[PDB]
Design a protein around this ligand. Structure first.
Ligand code: D6M
Length: 39
């Protein structure tokens, strides 16, 4: 009861992770990394 937008309150956590993972991949190298992207 209370709270709302449950899928968003999970999405922010998956986005912090996926975004930090994607920023890691770009920071680390991006297409130049060679590692496929976190996807
Ligand atoms: C949010 O989406 C977190 C998970 C996400 N992974 C993926 O998107 C890939 C698919 C993961 C499927 C996991 C299914 C687990 C089923 C239950 C297993 C119970 C037994 C386990 C025994 C060891 C991510 O980004 O990490």
């Amino acid at each position: 009861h209370x709270q709302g937008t449950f899928t968003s309150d999970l999405s922010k956590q998956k986005d912090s992770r996926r975004a930090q993972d994607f920023i890691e991949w770009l920071k680390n190298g991006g297409p130049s990394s060679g590692a496929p992207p976190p996807s």
